[PDB]
């Protein structure tokens, strides 16, 4: 009983954590694009 339920809990937790990792990667690259856009906006503004 300790075995099967805990192993299924962990198998579901793997998906739970991988979802948040993928979404964190998406938020990270969107942050990268945002900061690049702000820096290029500054570039054009100075020009």
């Amino acid at each position: 009983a300790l075995y099967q339920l805990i192993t299924e809990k962990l198998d579901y937790s793997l998906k739970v954590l991988q979802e948040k990792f993928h979404e964190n990667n998406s938020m990270c690259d969107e942050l990268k694009r945002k900061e690049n856009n702000f820096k290029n906006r500054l570039k054009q503004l100075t020009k």
Binding site: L17, Q18, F21, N24, C28, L31, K34, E35, F38
Partner: peptide, 23 residues
């Protein structure tokens, strides 16, 4: 996965702080 998730969260916090600083 938890370790790298925490790392990404910290980096995202830094990036958001920088964006707010320039914003």
């Amino acid at each position: 996965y938890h370790a790298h998730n925490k790392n990404r969260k910290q980096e995202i916090d830094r990036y958001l702080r920088t964006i707010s600083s320039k914003k």
